[PDB]
Amino acid sequence: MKLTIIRLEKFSDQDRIDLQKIWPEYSPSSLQVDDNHRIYAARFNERLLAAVRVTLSGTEGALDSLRVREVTRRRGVGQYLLEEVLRNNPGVSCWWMADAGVEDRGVMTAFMQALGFTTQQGGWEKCG
Ligand SMILES: CC(C)(COP(=O)(O)OP(=O)(O)OC[C@H]1O[C@@H](n2cnc3c(N)ncnc32)[C@H](O)[C@@H]1OP(=O)(O)O)[C@@H](O)C(=O)NCCC(=O)NCCS
Structure with missing residues (x-):
């Protein structure tokens, strides 16, 4: 069992629907990525x-x-997934994770702490 992490370079209407199924509060925008904003x-x-x-x-x-x-x-x-991202993106030493106003942040931080993230002054930081 390997989790296939794909980079969304192109968005079909099929992907469009399933994405909205993941974010039911998010109104379908253009869905437009660049080399920085990577979904x-x-x-x-x-x-x-x-x-x-x-x-x-x-x-x-x-x-x-x-x-x-x-x-x-x-x-x-x-x-x-998180480890995979940090293992395939070298050089990036400053990993900053936003809280995004998430209320499941209690669970999220538990996940963060057990994985290897620290909470610093308004978000999670992993410098390394
Ligand atoms: C929270 C969430 C990430 C758990 O997802 P997951 O893929 O199962 O996370 P993992 O299985 O990798 O984590 C389990 C590990 O995380 C840590 N952890 C601690 N408390 C945890 C918890 N309450 N829930 C999940 N993981 C927890 C542990 O180290 C645990 O390790 P273990 O399985 O050996 O005991 C998932 O429910 C989720 O993504 N939900 C929220 C999505 C969301 O609404 N986020 C808001 C973005 S705005």
Whole structure:
């Protein structure tokens, strides 16, 4: 079982629907990425199991939003994905994770602490 993390360089209307299924509060924008704003899609067996948006502004890593499917509250997928990103993106020493006003942040921080992130003055930081 390997989580296939794909980079969303092109958005079909099929992807469009499933993305809105992951973010039911998000009105369908243009869905437009660049070499900095990089949206990665973790598809486990063809289907979206997790979605994360990382804005690599230069060599700085800004992690905004991350949603794994609700049922996947413990299946390695989340940490696997985060580690995978940090293992395939070298040089980026400053990983900054936004809180995004998430209320499941209690659970999120528990995930963060057990994975290897620290909370500093308004968000999670991982310099390394
Ligand atoms: C929270 C969430 C990431 C758990 O997803 P996941 O892919 O199962 O995460 P993992 O399986 O990698 O993490 C389980 C590990 O995280 C840590 N952890 C601690 N508390 C945890 C918790 N309450 N839930 C999940 N992981 C937790 C542990 O180290 C655990 O390791 P273990 O399985 O060996 O015990 C998933 O439910 C999710 O993404 N939901 C929220 C998406 C969302 O709405 N986010 C807002 C973006 S605005």
